[PDB]
Design a binder for these strands. Sequence first.
DNA 1: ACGCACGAAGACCAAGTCAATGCTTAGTCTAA
Lengths: 240, 222, 328
Amino acid sequence: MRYPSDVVDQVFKLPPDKGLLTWDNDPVACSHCARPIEKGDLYSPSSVGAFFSDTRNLASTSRSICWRCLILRKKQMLNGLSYALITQDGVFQISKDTNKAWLFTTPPPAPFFVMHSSSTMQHLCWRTPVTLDNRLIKVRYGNNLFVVRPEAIREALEIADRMNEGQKKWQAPIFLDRKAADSGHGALTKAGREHLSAADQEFLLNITPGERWALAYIMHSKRPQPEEPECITSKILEKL
Amino acid sequence: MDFLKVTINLGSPMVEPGDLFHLDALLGALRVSEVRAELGDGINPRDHHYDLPLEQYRSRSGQWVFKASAFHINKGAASQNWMQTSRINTAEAARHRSEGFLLLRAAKPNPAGGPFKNSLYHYPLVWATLTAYCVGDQARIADLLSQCRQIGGRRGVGCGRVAGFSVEVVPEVECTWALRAMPDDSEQSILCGEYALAMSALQSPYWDRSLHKPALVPTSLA
Amino acid sequence: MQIEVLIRNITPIFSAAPGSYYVSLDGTINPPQGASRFPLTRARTMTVVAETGDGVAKAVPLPIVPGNTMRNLLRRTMLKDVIEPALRDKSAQLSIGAYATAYAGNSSGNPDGVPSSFDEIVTMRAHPFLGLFGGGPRMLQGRLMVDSLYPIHQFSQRIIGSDYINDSIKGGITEIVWTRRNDPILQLGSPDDAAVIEGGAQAANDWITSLLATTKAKKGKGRGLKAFNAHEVVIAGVKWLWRINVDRPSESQIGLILLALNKLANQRIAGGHAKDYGRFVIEDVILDGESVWTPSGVSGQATEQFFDAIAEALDGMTSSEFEQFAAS
DNA sequence: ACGCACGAAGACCAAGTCAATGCTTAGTCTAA
Ligand SMILES: [Zn+2]
């Protein structure tokens, strides 16, 4: 895939809705997924309504929405893709911690989109940049766009295991929060501050926010075993 | 035309950039500020943000980037997760609704969404010395950076004040300008370290998603 | 244009820090499991590097007021003291989109995302109020860049500077205030007290019996009114420095900022409305290195032009400008 | 008579943390 809207016609294969206008002016980017809207394509003027609180993430002021985004803005699409991973084969659910560990330790090779919501249901279909290479995974968490490097996650897990190797009571070296909301998120704990070497402390302080978020779901006393997430595109298509 | 190292010292913590913070983008922003002060706010910003004292690298396919590496982030302290909210005072809005200042017929506010939504967001704050490498004019770059006061982002709330800056000529062997978003078909010999393929813009502005292209992004800098 | 406001808080300033933090009776933050723990709401502390105890660099927390809080306080002061009375004098009425844009810069009025022509940008960014605080569906870049309220402390020397060294405080400036909530039913003492209650003695008896049963069940393994806890505040009397910069300000915008600074003393800082926290008095206002704060507020021969410009702007201000800015 | 009000609803996994700062010892005379 190339664009967030490309997930529709490639893994959902949903035909465009009826009654959509046809573009007849100089091409302009979509207001959601930044896809160009060329002459002869199907679009619709923006009618997001007063309850749309994602104006800051709009690609442009074209006020035009391509049919793929019009599909992606349906309630069944927003709810189904709350904790989704959209790859070529299908849409997978990464809600469970084991799924997150598998994704951030053994990512799929193909381009994919990573979905995650910080509340009941949020606009995430059209805000996630594509992950071209598995070594640089871009994850959209609520209003935060994260960059996760699997090698950094593996190195941090190795550091935590080596620091907790001797002590019988397991204790995390770095303070992390699943919601990425705590005031101490990403800061070293007392055990990390006074039981780790200078190189390990410098590495743990110099990780990206996305890596902290991922370790908040992976790094624990009993590391979850990675497992393949289930196929979810069937459920979303049936509910639509 | 000359090889440079740009060092920026902070007097206040800055927002830790989620993606690469590029020297050329900052220079373009400062140039746009200069042309705004000289002409006004009616200018097109895209007509003046390439007039920078930096020489360009052009690849086989014509894709070109500034020779200005992304800023290196070395943290003098652990990153602090800063919390900010947003809310409209409900009692004040109710008073205005009663007095006719506000034309709202709805009975209740909705903190979950709508005009009276309460929102919670976070961004990290870091104390760092900003060092980056570029090829250009020392005098003009130093002049442009003289008017720069804040670094990174969230400047409206005063994040990332500049205590000072320094521009020095350094040997080429120290560190190259390549630590940035290079075009897809860039030559391997000029790349410093491992380069992962990802989607990013090659010219400022870097937040414009319509300008995003597949590019080689340094793994040891993102 | 640099504005330096020297603020001394008469009452303690309480900006609640997110998180569930505990404290013991003796005052130990996060006491161990051995002793009793009570919830604590600490003040907003920012990790800063400083030369503490003759050290080269120490990351010590500094109790501050967030810059976004100061920005919103300035916006509310302008709205409630100059903008709203001026619009009321014209009997102006604002829609929900315009009002949301004016009071929080919320794009809910027109979340479609509206393009802005260069002439429109020039006209609107020159607005006396909406130009300073960008936002709305258009969502411009505001000309106002307000810094956080850093206290004049030993650890804030590298953030504030050495210009106000005479007012610095060496020791800690945080204190713990304990609160308590009592069940009013348990404080009844005579049938005259229970006369106002419809159930009289029977209702109070049932209330007390329910409380006792709930307490016994909780001890063995619905929450009552009784509660004991504390919240941490910055001690009163500490001086603060507020730095405000306006990028390319017009005369009207500077006049509005000066008017807000004149009326800023009537407002509160951060939270604590119930306990009258955050009360402060302006001590000095500095405009581009020139002191302007007279005992009768911001005045002088060098600021009459700003006041005249803002008065003229208020005379001709209409709600149509707000509607156009909010694309309503 | 399109615009706005207002409930129902649909995603639904789920840990480990919560200090960040202590530090010593007597010469000057050159304005009333
Ligand atoms: Zn689209």
